[PDB]
Structures are given as C-alpha cells and as structure tokens.
Amino acid sequence: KVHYAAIDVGSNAVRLLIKCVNSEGMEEPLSKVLIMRVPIRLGEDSFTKGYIGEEKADNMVRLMRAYNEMMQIYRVKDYRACATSAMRDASNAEAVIAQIREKTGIHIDIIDGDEEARLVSDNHIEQIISDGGNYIYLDVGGGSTELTLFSDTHIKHSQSFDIGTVRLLSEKVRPYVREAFRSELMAITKEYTDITIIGTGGNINRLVRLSGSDRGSSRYSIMPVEALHKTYDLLKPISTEERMVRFHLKPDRADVIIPAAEIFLEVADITGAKTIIAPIVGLADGIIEDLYIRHQ
Amino acid sequence: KVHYAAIDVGSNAVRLLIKCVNSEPLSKVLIMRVPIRLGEDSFTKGYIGEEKADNMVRLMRAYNEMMQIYRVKDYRACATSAMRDASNAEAVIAQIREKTGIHIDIIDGDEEARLVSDNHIEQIISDGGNYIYLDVGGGSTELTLFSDTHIKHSQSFDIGTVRLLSEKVRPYVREAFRSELMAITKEYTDITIIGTGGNINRLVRLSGSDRGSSRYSIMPVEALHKTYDLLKPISTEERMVRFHLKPDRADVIIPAAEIFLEVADITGAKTIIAPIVGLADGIIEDLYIRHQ
Ligand SMILES: [Mg+2]
Ligand SMILES: [Mg+2]
Ligand SMILES: [Mg+2]
Ligand SMILES: [Mg+2]
Ligand SMILES: [Mg+2]
Ligand SMILES: [Mg+2]
Ligand SMILES: [Mg+2]
Secondary structure (H helix, E strand, O other), X not given: OOEEEEEEEOOXXXXXXXXXXXXXXXXXXXXXXXXXXXOOOHHHHHHHHOOOOHHHHHHHHHHHHHHHHHHHHOOOOEEEEEEOHHHHOOOOHHHHHHHHHHHHOOOEEXXXXXXXXXXXXXXXXXXXXXXXXXXXXXXXXXXXXXXXXXXXXXXXXXXXXXXXXXXXXXXXXXXXXXXXXXXXXXXXXXXXXXXXXEEEOHHHHHHXXXXXXXXXXXXXXXXXXXXXXXXXXXXXXXXXXXXXXXXXXXXXXXXXXXXXXXXXXXXXXXXXXXXXXXXXXXXXXXXXXXXXXXXX | OOEEEEEEEOOOOEEEEEEEEOOOOEEEEEEEEEOOOHHHHHHHHOOOOHHHHHHHHHHHHHHHHHHHHOOOOEEEEXXXXXXXXXXXXXXXXXXXXXXXXXXXXXXXXXXXXXOOOHHHHHHHOOOOOEXXXXXXXXXXXXXXXXXXXXXXXXXXXXXXXXXXXXXXXXXXXXXXXXXHHHHHHHHOOOEEEEEEOHHHHHHHHHOOOOOOOOOOEEEXXXXXXXXXXXXXXXXXXXXXXXXXXXXXXXXXXXXXXXXHXXXXXXXXXXXXXXXXXXXXXXXXXXXXXXXX
C-alpha cells in the first residue's frame, strides 16, 4: 500500500510515474502502477527561443495540477520532480518553477547532466550487467543523451551530451558537440569489445515494438541492431504524418523517433554493438529508487 | 490543431482520450488510464463509496486540466456499468459537475454497445465475412454480430471482469450470453472475433501478437489459450512482477481471458483481431461527426 511518485520534466514529454512497494518475497521491490506521458515539448521553446514561453509555462502549471491530483489519489508517501535539458537551458527556468510551486505546490528540481546520468534504476542495471560484460546504458532524450559505460559489474565512464531528438529537429545542436560525442564512442571502442547497448527512452521503446522485438512474456525486450536498422529504413523516407497514421504513432513521437533511431544507430555503428536491451526503465524509475532507499 | 476528448468512466479504469483532426481523419495524441475500480464498490455495496467518489472528483479535475492544455473543441464523458448499478450515481455525478465542471452522461447498455469507432470496424469487416466485435469491461460485455458488412445483432450482458472477481455475475446472465453465442454459431460460420478492452491489448502482447509495424494485432485463439495457461496458476502478485502487469490489470486479466476463450470455444473462432480502439474512440467519432 506504499506508493512513491516521480515527475520527469524532460524536453519532449513530461511524465508522472507511480510505483508501489511490493511484498518481501517478490523479486523487484517496486512495481509500476501508473504512468502518464504528456508532450509539452519545452525544448521546442528552450532550444530555439532560449526560454520557456508563456503558453508552455501555463500548460506546465495545468499539468502539475493534474499530476498533483493523481499523486493525491494514490496517497503517495513521497515524490520528487526533476527537470533536465530544456529547463537547464531556459533563461527563465527559475521563474517558471517558482510559478509552478506558487500555483500547484509541486517543487521541481533542476538537475545537471551528471546527476541526470546517474538518476537511474541501479537495481535493474545491476541485474542486467552481472555477467561482467561490457554495456553502454544510453538514455536518448529530447535535449541530451546520457552514456554510461559498464564493465565487470562496475561503472567506468558516465557523461551527458547535448544531443537530443528535439534539439536535432530544431537544428540547434552546437558546433563540435557531435564530434566530441563520436570521439568519446571511439575511445570506448578502442578499449572495450563485445559491447551490449542498454537503451532507454520513449523512442527506443516504440522502436523495439515497431521492429518486432516487443517484450511480451519475456523478462526483457531484446532488439538486434539490424532489426532497428531495418525499422529505420522503413520510417525515414515517408513524411511524419504518414508515419503517424501508417504506424500508429502519436504526433509528438512520429517526428522525434527518426533522430532517436539515428542516435542509437550511430552508437551501435561505432561500438560494433549488435544488441540493444530495452528494460523499459528511465529517469523516473531512478527517482523512485532513490525515494525507496531513503525511506528504507 | 482541432482536438476532441472523451472521458470513459468504466468499472475498472477511468480513461481520458484526446485525438486531433488530421487531413484516418483522427489520430490519438493522449491517453490516460486511472484504476478507480468503481465496480468494486458498485457491484458489492450497490453504491459508490466516499473514497472512490472523492477520487473521481480528483480525477475529473486532472482530466479537465488536460482538456484545457489541448484547448479541446468538444468533449463527452460517459459512464457505464458501475455507475448504472450504483444507487447514488446521480448524486456523485451532480457533485462532480459542481466541483469540477465535467458533466458525465450515464448511458445504457444499448448505447454503450453502439458507441464505437465505426470507421475502424467498417474497414475490418469490408470483406463481408462474419465477425463478432466484443467489448469486455469490468461490469458488462457488449457483443455485436457483423455479416455482409451489416449489423445483425447487438447486445450488452452484465458480465465483466470486476463483476466476476466479486462473484456477482447473475447465473441467468451467463446462460443468456451462452445461448446467444450458440444461436450465432448455429447460423454463421467462419467467425472472426474483433476484441477490445484494456485486457485484450495486454493479452495480445503477452501472446507474442503485438502489431508493431503491421496494421492490426492478430492473435490466434490458440496463443491466447497458452497465455492463459501461463498466467492462471500463478498468484496475482507474482504475475504483476513476472509479466510486468500493473496491479489493477493483473487480477482482471484472468476473467477477461476466460470470457474471450468462451466466445471462441462456442463459436469456433480461430482468430482475434485487436484494433486497439474502444468506447472512447466511439465518443470522439461522434463528436467529430457532430462538428463536420
Ligand atoms: Mg529525460
Ligand atoms: Mg536528457
Ligand atoms: Mg539513485
Ligand atoms: Mg467500458
Ligand atoms: Mg461495460
Ligand atoms: Mg478487453
Ligand atoms: Mg457513433
């Protein structure tokens, strides 16, 4: 009956996640009970205007009220709300957040890239990487991409890069950012072989399903990089509203799925990774793991 | 640029669906699903309890905020089996309207049966084959028989997942469901089931029949039967963890499978098409028709 909630204020959708604490004998201590995903796309303002415009600020207030009602319905014990790239990069970020407290009671923390990269479900990663192999946990968002290297059950390198789906669509990725990202991947490939990608983000979960790799009754959904590539070639050459209708994609997903696939494919090409494991956890899950640990 | 919303006040989850007008005429942009499980109160106590009614007010506030975010042109909120059966339904709805601005219509089972996306059904049945469109809810199940592209029968039965878990399904209703299914089978061959509900969409994925890049998810009944045998013996909580089911889904998925398997066993249907549309899509179709 204990519930925790996380609010993930990213650069495309803004999410609410609620999880329950399970019984002791169960495997995972925590199970998802409710997930909401609302496409405010703050990054569309942030990365092109430099600030959050009034329409999205007001919609964020409305959304935070809605998520507050939902947290009240589940009588959640504790929560945290984090915002990432699009709020980091907005000049009026503090004003927008203060309006949201005043009007809704919800307190949003702005977290930097480093905190973002480590705000993960270590419990899920620990179990995936326990064979001691080499893994790259890759979170592709709307404004940034976090890469964490795992080898021999131990964390080796963790970095945030300002390449994301909405920033790419807006054509606002800045000089030398792609190059630095490529250079980091090559230094990883020179030193780590047989890399498996652990892919997270709303885009990779939809890609895994479009490519025929849905989890189903399995513990993990596992997508070959070749399956992703074939799916990419299917999606790239048609327009976005045709992608919507033909493949049952929400409008806020049908455009960003392309640069998302391109990021994963670049990472896979450089590292020679053949497999993407998609555990369907993300930043919200990492918030709830922290909350669970805090309260024991 | 134009958005319509539907609020579907069911007996297990309470849903918000928002679609945009394209230039399919309508695309899904937002879906929210919150498990109030009104039927747990209604089919047992015969009214909505105060906790669930308070949560309904909270929920309609949240969905109203969502509808404001999308500047929706029009909406409709419909309530079905659990509200029909609750003695204080109109009081709860009047208070919801006063406190939130959301007006909920209580619809009867005939209206519920026909409150569907006829645009999607029309495409699935255009070859003129025999189809049963089946909506399995928490409180009632709607059956519509299609043949030669025409509607041949439409009926609602007070059999649902939450009503079954509560052991409140009247035996006479089970007999009527079976008799109608037998009369259909006597008269129509080569039946395909068109299945809808939150439960069927999940059972489709567990059975390895997710659509992904296909137009429709198509599950052989044999695969549903194996998925049922995988899920049944396990405890509700283990299913939750092992098969990644939300708690409000991990119990009702069993009687939902059983309803679908009974339909398939009696009619001999080999296939279930799951087009991932439901009552909420039917509301939005109606709103779109009204404003065209
Ligand atoms: Mg993010
Ligand atoms: Mg990010
Ligand atoms: Mg942590
Ligand atoms: Mg229903
Ligand atoms: Mg019903
Ligand atoms: Mg169903
Ligand atoms: Mg209609």
